[PDB]
Amino acid sequence: DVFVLDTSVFTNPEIYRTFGAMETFIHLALNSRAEFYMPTSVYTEMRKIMDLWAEFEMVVKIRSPRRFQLTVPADFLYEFIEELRYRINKGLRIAEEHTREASGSEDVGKLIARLREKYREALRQGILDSKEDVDVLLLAYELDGVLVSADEGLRTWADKIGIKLIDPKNFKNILESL
Amino acid sequence: VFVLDTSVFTNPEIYRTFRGAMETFIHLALNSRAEFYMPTSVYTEMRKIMDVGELWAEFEMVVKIRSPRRFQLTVPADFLYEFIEELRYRINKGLRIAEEHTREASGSEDVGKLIARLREKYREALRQGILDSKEDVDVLLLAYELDGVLVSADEGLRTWADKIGIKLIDPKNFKNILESLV
Amino acid sequence: DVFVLDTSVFTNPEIYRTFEEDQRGAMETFIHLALNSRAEFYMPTSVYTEMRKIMDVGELWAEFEMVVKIRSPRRFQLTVPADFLYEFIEELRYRINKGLRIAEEHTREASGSEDVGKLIARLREKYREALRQGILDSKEDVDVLLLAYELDGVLVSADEGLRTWADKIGIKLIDPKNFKNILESLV
Amino acid sequence: DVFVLDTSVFTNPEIYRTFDQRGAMETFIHLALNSRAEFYMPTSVYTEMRKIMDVGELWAEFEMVVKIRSPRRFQLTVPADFLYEFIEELRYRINKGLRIAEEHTREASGSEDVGKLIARLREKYREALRQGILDSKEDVDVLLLAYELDGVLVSADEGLRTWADKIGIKLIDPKNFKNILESLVR
Amino acid sequence: DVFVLDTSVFTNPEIYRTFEEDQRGAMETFIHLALNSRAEFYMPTSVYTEMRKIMDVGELWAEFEMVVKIRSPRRFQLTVPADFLYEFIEELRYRINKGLRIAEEHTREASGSEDVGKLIARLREKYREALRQGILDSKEDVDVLLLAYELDGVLVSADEGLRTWADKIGIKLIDPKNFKNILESLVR
Amino acid sequence: DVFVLDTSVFTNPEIYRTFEEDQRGAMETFIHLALNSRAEFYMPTSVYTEMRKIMDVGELWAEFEMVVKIRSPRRFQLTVPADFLYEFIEELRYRINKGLRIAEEHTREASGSEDVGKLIARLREKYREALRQGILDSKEDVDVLLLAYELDGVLVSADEGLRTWADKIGIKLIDPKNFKNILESLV
Amino acid sequence: MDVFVLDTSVFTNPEIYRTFEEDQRGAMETFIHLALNSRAEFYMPTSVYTEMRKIMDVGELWAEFEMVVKIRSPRRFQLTVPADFLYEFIEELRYRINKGLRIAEEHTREASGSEDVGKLIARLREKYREALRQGILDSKEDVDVLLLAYELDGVLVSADEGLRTWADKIGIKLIDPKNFKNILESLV
RNA sequence: AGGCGCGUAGCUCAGUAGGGAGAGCGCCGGCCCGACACGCCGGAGGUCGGGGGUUCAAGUCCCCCCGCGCCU
């Protein structure tokens, strides 16, 4: 199986505990005859995030999204655009509440982190956040492989697009059982 | 095959370019030997944001209110990637704007101005230059499926239609365009 | 253009109040304005039989069968998107659960209640509201939907479930209340 | 050999008898890993299968042999007569259910008993509205995933069987699936 | 605009009764109202030949050939759904079994009966009812069905088999008792 | 290679006599020949149901499903020539008239003669030979025809009516007495 | 609106031109008046027209026959016929050829014993011609009539049993040649 | 998700090579008795739940569908 693993399954506390952890993963991921194939943009974003790397690049092939030959359903974009309005409005309401709180009391160093967390939770959790996730979705919908990841939005979009999903907390056990 | 939108009739500028603008548009389209297709969502939004009266029963005989049939359409993945990148950039910009507004609100005693400024910044950073309403996506899909001209006024809709591959038009000359083809 | 008619176009009180003022005269004015306007009007045979079994206009059915082309949707050469069936079943399961729950509440209320005909009427009305409003309730609505789909015509209906599920397919929809005015202008 | 699976394969008592649910999962996996077949259960069916029963740590090994994915309904189509027949029979049942509710309420009027009669009404309503026809969207997912893959539908749900037959889906006897996997492995 | 005519339009005791009195003259007024409506009236050649074999009016055929376009369906360029033939065969099996049952009961009744000629007549009537009423029986029916299907025309017949299978196949049906009034309103 | 199987392949004495003996080893050896053939055998669901009604082995049906694929012919996407229906209806009319003649002859011979018990059996034989021998006589046969037509597969059946009406469609036919030897070398 | 594709048998076969004014020549002139007034569109293929001018002959009447009846080839390069049509044609031709051979054998054997070949030659000619060329397409003229009626979707007017029979198998509108006079008369 | 059992007179139930539509209990006409009671007889007492097949013959055997329940 061509497992299309994203960065959420490679660099994350839950991902690392379930599967530093790169060596313990590659102990059996390169085995079991499963040709993992990660996106190239996902690899670049992971490298920008955090990081033997040349050996980890010798198992999962960093391929291109190949969006030229790929097409997306119209409903798959309508459902994204419908949730985008709700997420943006929730973020705007959170910002308005933060401004109202700052009007009365003044704590910049405590309000800035809270506002950043609220924005990142209400506008980047539960939906496709970046282009590095759309690339993974397109690669999975093109290679017809597994879509091991941990993002709720990525999983709920891959399920709505027809991609196959395998439990991230079970990816290590699945790879070790094949 | 002109895929109309709400901007072509809700905007006072486009209406004045032509209850009178609707009648003139109906009379022009009913004799221009042309097809007009307005999505059901966009038409519902326009009818809930307009009260033209006595012309909704004549625009139905000129325009064709129908859904873009998203079940059969297939948007290119390149447009999705471009929209995702633009949305991520706009989300980062909106978060930065919200942080700046929160920082600036410390020294201000009138929330009625800071909140309004934040709302204006958000409605132009996260809802301009990209598709924002489901009606816009419906218009784009209806134009792409029927291979028509996405007559509208929003810049984000025009940019998305150009990226997808749908031929665009100019609302300024839209009345002139329908006048020549009549 | 092609107008796919329905039973609600001739049976709904408001629809035959915009169509003249009497239900019999409504269909006669429909014949008057549909023999004109140079348009094509279609109704499924099942819908036609149900509508003819609801009301009886007599000798006007002869003039009615002319302009309205009564025929089956030709479902063998027709197809429906799978997402449509998915969404219909998803809504239907919820409405079935709602109907079962309201039946339970009505039974528990009638346990101690004295008057029973009133509660039986309440159960009937609430059940037909919770299970036959908002979706495709009969295969007559399905026939109207499919005839509109294959003809690329405008589904003329006052039923809200029919209009909703025609929109979710991609069928052109008209506003039933003013349909006489889309008809009067065409002539 | 592509085998689209349902909840009923591991939810029905007789089907895992012809295989304990925990042991049945393991024997099915044993026979499915080396069957050289392609087992495809839908994602919504998988979610409801997780919700009805929980098996300890066997989901991890379940997930790779039994591929889990959505039917991809945007590229699939269903015959018009299929929906026509479904909604005709659906109307029929809905009516039957209304009559059952009327019967139970009118006989509950002079009975004073509700604790057993509510259960009887539940059973009659479920029998008259959800047995022999497609009820959940999970059934539709199994149907369409077998239709797209030209799949063998393995299910103990008689409604799923009789409505997959109307589509053209290769149907199988769920009581023979284990001894089918036997011969397939051999 | 396109009406496909069966034999019942001019031979059934009721349809010609609506048009006029008696089989003759009814077809005459039908012609009067048919060359006046601009519609395209059609009937298959087999149906025409068998109808002429049933009713043998004289010179009326001369002006009848002008209006009704006698024409066999182009069955080579026509197709019928698989489910249509499936349903036809499935129902016909039941009808054949019913006819066999009727035959057995009539044989057993005649085993102890004296007026065997009238028993034979009743067996004839019951067999004809059980095997040919409510279903397409002759190739005339199939020819009418295909002629209406290919032309996208309006089938006019008082045969319940014709109507109930034209409905299954997708042909615009019409009430044969109102078709004279339809001709009048098409003229006017 | 695709073979669309009938009921006669494993129920009619001649074919299952070529396919070994006892009719229970027949299916066993058939499946055998089918396993190492890569020949994609098929059977319609209705024919399989009638098979299970007529014959019942037990645990051989366990391995019957692995080689033979049972599914409906997908009649919604299939079409049949109009001339086929025309010919079928005309021949069926002839056979119905012959059956009525047989009935009205046996009634007359019951009028005068005796022993109606064997007379009924003779009437049954003559009627079922006049109406069902040499023509399509069940929807199972129609399903076999349609599944062979859609798949462009080989129709294996000793029914003379099935072969005769499959030839008129364009279905690759085969001698049912040679299917075993066909299967032997196809390995 | 209505187009008739004429044949040679229309004005050559005794009965058909006897429906018009008598004699093969006056019937032509009366048909000319009736067809000119009808405002229809009559046609006949070129080969059939040549066989007309050869088998029959009039002077200064074809100068008027050229106008109403439009003589042209059926334009056969843009036309097709069903495969089953040719299949049935050659199937029937095989039987006719075998029967003609048997007739020839029987007449040779009759001439063997009876030395009266003078009338036997005529009898054999009549039987052979009836055996292979009666009631079937037997000349490219008939094929041209068929194809000109098929391309125009017109009314085939002919007294030939074979031409009508084989036009019925392809979907050509047919008429009774013995009232075709009155098809035109009431049409005017 | 399915499984089993039973629908037979007014009630409760037997019946099977597939060769009868019954028993007990009811109701009436008889009958000892003034007459009802008891006994003693008989008559009335059928969609064998429905449809489809097979048979010479079906409540019986096969298929499907309803109802009643028990169901785990």
UniProtKB/Swiss-Prot annotation, chain A:
RNA-free RNase P that catalyzes the removal of the 5'-leader sequence from pre-tRNA to produce the mature 5'-terminus. SUPFAM superfamilies: PIN domain-like (SSF88723). It is an enzyme of class 3 (hydrolase). This is RNA-free ribonuclease P. Belongs to the HARP family. It comes from Aquifex aeolicus (strain VF5). It comes from the Bacteria. GO terms for biological process: tRNA 5'-leader removal. PANTHER family: RNA-FREE RIBONUCLEASE P, UPF0278 PROTEIN TK1425. Probably forms homotrimers. Its EC number is 3.1.26.5.
Curated annotation (Swiss-Prot), chain B:
Changing D138A: No change in activity. It catalyses: Endonucleolytic cleavage of RNA, removing 5'-extranucleotides from tRNA precursor. Changing D154A: Abolishes activity. Its EC number is 3.1.26.5. GO terms for molecular function: ribonuclease P activity. It comes from the Bacteria. Keywords: Endonuclease, Hydrolase, Nuclease, tRNA processing. Changing D132A: Abolishes activity. GO terms for biological process: tRNA 5'-leader removal. RNA-free RNase P that catalyzes the removal of the 5'-leader sequence from pre-tRNA to produce the mature 5'-terminus. Probably forms homotrimers. Belongs to the HARP family. This is RNA-free ribonuclease P. It comes from Aquifex aeolicus (strain VF5). The lineage of its organism: Bacteria, Pseudomonadati, Aquificota, Aquificia, Aquificales.
UniProtKB/Swiss-Prot annotation, chains C, F:
The keyword tRNA processing applies. It catalyses: Endonucleolytic cleavage of RNA, removing 5'-extranucleotides from tRNA precursor. Keywords: Endonuclease, Hydrolase, Nuclease, tRNA processing. Its EC number is 3.1.26.5. Changing D159A: Abolishes activity. GO terms for molecular function: ribonuclease P activity. GO terms for biological process: tRNA 5'-leader removal. Changing D143A: No change in activity. Changing D137A: Abolishes activity. RNA-free RNase P that catalyzes the removal of the 5'-leader sequence from pre-tRNA to produce the mature 5'-terminus. Probably forms homotrimers. Belongs to the HARP family. This is RNA-free ribonuclease P. It comes from Aquifex aeolicus (strain VF5).
From Swiss-Prot, chain D:
It holds the Pfam family PIN_5. Its EC number is 3.1.26.5. It catalyses: Endonucleolytic cleavage of RNA, removing 5'-extranucleotides from tRNA precursor. Changing D157A: Abolishes activity. Keywords: Endonuclease, Hydrolase, Nuclease, tRNA processing. CDD domains: PIN_VapC-like (cd18691). GO terms for biological process: tRNA 5'-leader removal. InterPro entries: PIN-like_dom_sf, RNA_free_RNase_P. It comes from the Bacteria. Changing D139A: Abolishes activity. The keyword Metal-binding does not apply. Probably forms homotrimers. PANTHER family: RNA-FREE RIBONUCLEASE P, UPF0278 PROTEIN TK1425. RNA-free RNase P that catalyzes the removal of the 5'-leader sequence from pre-tRNA to produce the mature 5'-terminus. Belongs to the HARP family. This is RNA-free ribonuclease P. It comes from Aquifex aeolicus (strain VF5).
